[PDB]
């Protein structure tokens, strides 16, 4: 019986066993002291007393529109506030990384082996009184029963923030470059060895695959013209492997950076758009540098698209999610006078937290047509029939589902929801409340406090028994949403540090990289700093249709 099974060390203290039945807490630089690191120093009490709650800060950022309008248009003020948002978030992240699924203590194996997802909290020891430590019952509830009673959609619940399918598929497309679970190996392992925004889902994970996708003229990527429009090349032509069922004919097997993007037309849509953007940038650079060769044109274009991606994700994507009247800003210079590590390791909990299944609709609405899940998946024929323009117009206006609030997961992906729970247990995640404490949030003291409701909280009580036994994934989906919001508190407060760290931690944001020469001059640099979700569609989609991450 491991002495640290009770997770006795508080406030990010480190538990270490000293003997078979005793433990010791390392309170170094926690701001606390005592046996469990639970007694605050003088300075710590003052900081705590003066620290406003996340909900308070959230209220201020989502109100006083007249105030933020002025702040947004004064760089001095906007920079100082954005600088605060960045610094205070990333400090909750261990960098360089620490634990993974196989190590609850610091080890060189955990640090050096990039095949693992890292871990924000160490795994629960193998031999503990309960699966989660000491709290709860000897056996966790049946994972399918959790999904059915708490997560399954009885009736479609639209997102009150108005997120659309353009947002939903952007989210899936973007995150699947660093969420690349090596399932044949196990949920603890990833294929994304770059561990961040490298755009491997466009260019490929290895040089061998990249060379299959490249045209080797003017720095461009291979493509084909169908009905006058640019689309990805075929598998037969590139010999770049893709995941396709037998029923998909050869001429419809599109080859892109990510092997699984043929699964759903929504992904292939963004894959096509980003492909168009790369070759567009190549033309721009070739005009600016007629002396450059194919290789430098390719490499510089890739760096620019990485910049565009981070720019769009912060100022459009995260901006939409936050609901802030304050306008977030992508500016690496904000950190040049701060302590910050330019590196990133993808955490398993970050992956799990991003299982935003409830976003998915009951049917997919393209033009005047509707498709069920069986018709939609692996169906590139739909994409060619309607075209990218029609796809953009339809997805922009189709609303997505609310993620928090419970019971909004489509039955079509019921087994996927269960898988998230099963894998979480396989990797021995700690409880939901342990993760709330890990990110300096007060733990919930009752099921009713979690959901803000009596029905689902009663079912939670019947299943888990104790609030400290509730698991991470289901609790995130049943958590009381913030007022008219898509998420609950925990989703934001745990997710934002991971998100922002991986964005600003990118190498191109470092002082040695963030300069005009890196991107082929001011022309390439400007492409990055003026990028938006609207400009991406306008530049690469016929007719330049209106688009947004929110419904009109």
Ligand X SMILES: *[C@@H]1O[C@H](CO)[C@@H](O[C@@H]2O[C@H](CO)[C@@H](O)[C@H](O)[C@H]2NC(C)=O)[C@H](O)[C@H]1NC(C)=O
Ligand Y SMILES: *[C@@H]1O[C@H](CO)[C@@H](O[C@@H]2O[C@H](CO)[C@@H](O[C@H]3O[C@H](CO)[C@@H](O)[C@H](O)[C@@H]3O)[C@H](O)[C@H]2NC(C)=O)[C@H](O)[C@H]1NC(C)=O
Ligand Z SMILES: CCCCCCCCO[C@@H]1O[C@H](CO)[C@@H](O)[C@H](O)[C@H]1O
Q: How far is the CB of 247 from ligand NAG (least distance, A)?
A: 6
| Residue 287 binding result from ligand Y, its own copies, ligand X, none, given CB thresholds of 5 to 8 Å by partner type | none
Structure tokens given for 255: 């080859």
Q: Is 35 in the site for ligand NAG (CB under 6 A)?
A: yes
Q: Is 426 in the site for ligand Y (CB under 6 A)?
A: no
Task: Give the number of residues in contact with ligand Z, rule: CB under 6 A.
Answer: 6
Residue carrying structure tokens 């168009």: 276
Q: How far is the CB of 19 from its own copies (least distance, A)?
A: 6
Alpha carbon of 431 to those of 171, 247, 426, 448: distances in Å? 26, 43, 13, 17
Give the residue with the Cβ less far from its own copies, 117 or 473.
117
Give the residue with the Cβ less far from ligand Y, 103 or 549.
103
| Residue 459 binding result from ligand Y, ligand Z, ligand COH, none, given CB thresholds of 5 to 8 Å by partner type | ligand Z
Residue carrying structure tokens 């890196």: 518
DSSP single-letter state for residue 399? B
Q: Is 459 in the site for ligand Z (CB under 6 A)?
A: yes
Distance CA 549, CA 316 (A): 8
Q: Is 69 in the site for ligand X (CB under 6 A)?
A: no
| Phi, psi angle pair for 150, to nearest 5° | -125, -35
What are the DSSP E strand ranges found in 360-451? 364-366, 369-371
The catalytic residue among 7, 176, 201, 278 is 176
| Options 62, 177, 181, 490; binder of ligand COH; rule CB under 6 A | 181
Which stretch, 146-154, 199-207, 348-356, 362-370, contacts ligand Z (CB under 6 A)? Answer: 146-154
- Name the β-bridge partners of 163: 550
Q: Is 457 in the site for ligand Z (CB under 6 A)?
A: no
Distance CA 548, CA 25 (A): 49
Say whether 203 sits in a helix, a strand or coil.
Answer: helix
Residues 146-185 that bind ligand Y (CB under 6 A): 185
Distance CA 457, CA 464 (A): 10
| Residue 379 binding result from ligand NAG, ligand Z, its own copies, none, given CB thresholds of 5 to 8 Å by partner type | ligand NAG
Cα Rg for the chain, rounded, in angstroms? 24
HEC readout, 99-138: EECCECCCCHHHHHCCCECEECCCCCCCCCCECCECCCCC
HSE toward the beta carbon, residue 40, CA cutoff 13 A? 9
**Minimal CB distance to ligand X: which residue?**
207
Structure tokens given for 471: 């698991």
Give the residue with the Cβ less far from ligand Y, 111 or 373.
111
Residue 342 annotated in active site: no
| Residue 510 binding result from its own copies, ligand Y, ligand X, none, given CB thresholds of 5 to 8 Å by partner type | its own copies
| Options 35, 284, 513, 539; binder of its own copies; rule CB under 8 A | 513
Q: Is 229 in the site for ligand Z (CB under 6 A)?
A: no
357 annotated to bind ligand: yes
Distance CA 216, CA 373 (A): 38
Q: Is 385 in the site for ligand NAG (CB under 6 A)?
A: yes
119 annotated to bind ligand: no
Asked whether the beta carbons of 287 and 180 are under 8 A apart, the reply is no
Residue 103 annotated in active site: no
How does 177-200 read in b/e, with b if 16+ C-beta sit within 10 Å?
A: bbbbbeeeeebbbbbbebbbbbbb
Distance CA 284, CA 509 (A): 22
Give the residue with the Cβ less far from ligand COH, 114 or 215.
114
| Options 3, 6, 327, 453; binder of ligand NAG; rule CB under 6 A | 6
| Options 119, 149, 253, 436; binder of ligand Z; rule CB under 6 A | 149
Give the footprint of ligand COH on this chain (CB under 6 A). 168, 171-172, 175, 179-181, 260, 264, 266, 351, 354-356, 359-360, 377, 413, 416, 419-420, 423
Give the footprint of ligand X on this chain (CB under 6 A). 113, 115, 185, 206-208
Q: Which residues are catalytic?
A: 176, 354
- Binding-site residues from annotation: 89, 324, 357
- Binding-site residues from annotation for heme b: 357
Give the footprint of ligand Y on this chain (CB under 6 A). 6, 8, 35-36, 38, 113, 115, 185, 206-208
């Amino acid at each position: 019986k491991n002495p640290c099974c009770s997770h006795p060390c508080q406030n990010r203290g480190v538990c270490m066993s000293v003997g078979f039945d005793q433990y010791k807490c390392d309170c170094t630089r926690t701001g606390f002291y005592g046996e469990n690191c639970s007694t605050p120093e003088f300075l710590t009490r003052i900081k705590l007393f003066l620290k406003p709650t996340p909900n308070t800060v959230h209220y201020i950022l989502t109100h006083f529109k007249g105030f933020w309008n002025v702040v947004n248009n004064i760089p001095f003020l906007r920079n100082a506030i954005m600088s605060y948002v960045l610094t205070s978030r990333s400090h909750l992240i261990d960098s360089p990384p620490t634990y993974n699924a196989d190590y609850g203590y610091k080890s060189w194996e955990a640090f050096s082996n990039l095949s693992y997802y890292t871990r924000a909290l160490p795994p629960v020891p193998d031999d503990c009184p309960t699966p989660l430590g000491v709290k709860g019952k000897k056996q966790l509830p049946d994972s399918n029963e959790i999904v059915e009673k708490l997560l399954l959609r009885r009736k479609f619940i639209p997102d009150p923030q108005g997120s659309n399918m353009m947002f939903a598929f952007f989210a899936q497309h973007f995150t699947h470059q660093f969420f690349k679970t090596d399932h044949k190996r196990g949920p603890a392992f990833t294929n994304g060895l770059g561990h961040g925004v490298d755009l491997n889902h466009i260019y490929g994970e290895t040089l061998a695959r990249q060379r299959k996708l490249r045209l080797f003229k003017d720095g461009k990527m291979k493509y084909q013209i169908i009905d006058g429009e640019m689309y990805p090349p075929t598998v037969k032509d590139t010999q770049a492997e893709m995941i396709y069922p037998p029923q998909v004919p050869e001429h419809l097997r599109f080859a892109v950076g990510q092997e699984v993007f043929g699964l759903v037309p929504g992904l292939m849509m963004y894959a096509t758009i980003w492909l168009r953007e790369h070759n567009r940038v190549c033309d721009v650079l070739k005009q600016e540098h007629p002396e450059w060769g194919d290789e430098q044109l390719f490499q510089t274009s890739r760096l620019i698209l990485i910049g565009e991606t981070i720019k769009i994700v912060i100022e459009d994507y995260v901006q939409h999610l936050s609901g802030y009247h304050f306008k977030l800003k992508f500016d690496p210079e904000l950190l040049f006078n701060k302590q910050f590590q330019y590196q990133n390791r993808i955490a398993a909990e970050f992956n799990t937290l991003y299982h935003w299944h409830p976003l998915l609709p009951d049917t997919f609405q393209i033009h005047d047509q509707k498709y069920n899940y069986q018709q939609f998946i692996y169906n590139n024929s739909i994409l060619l029939e309607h075209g990218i323009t029609q796809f953009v117009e339809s997805f922009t206006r189709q609303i997505a589902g609310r993620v928090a609030g419970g019971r909004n997961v489509p039955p079509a992906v019921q087994k996927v929801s269960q898988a998230s729970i099963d894998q979480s247990r396989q990797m021995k995640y700690q409880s939901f409340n342990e993760y709330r404490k890990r990110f300096m949030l007060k733990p919930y003291e009752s099921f009713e406090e979690l959901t803000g409701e009596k029905e689902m909280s009663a079912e939670l009580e019947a299943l888990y028994g104790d609030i400290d036994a509730v698991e991470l994934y289901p609790a995130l989906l049943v958590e009381k949403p913030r007022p008219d919001a898509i998420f609950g508190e925990t989703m934001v407060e745990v997710g934002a540090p991971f998100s922002l760290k991986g964005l600003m931690g990118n190498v191109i944001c470092s002082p040695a990289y963030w300069k005009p020469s890196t991107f082929g001059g001011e022309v390439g640099f400007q492409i990055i700093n003026t990028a938006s979700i609207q400009s991406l569609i306008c530049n690469n989609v016929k007719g330049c249709p209106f688009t947004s991450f929110s419904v009109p």
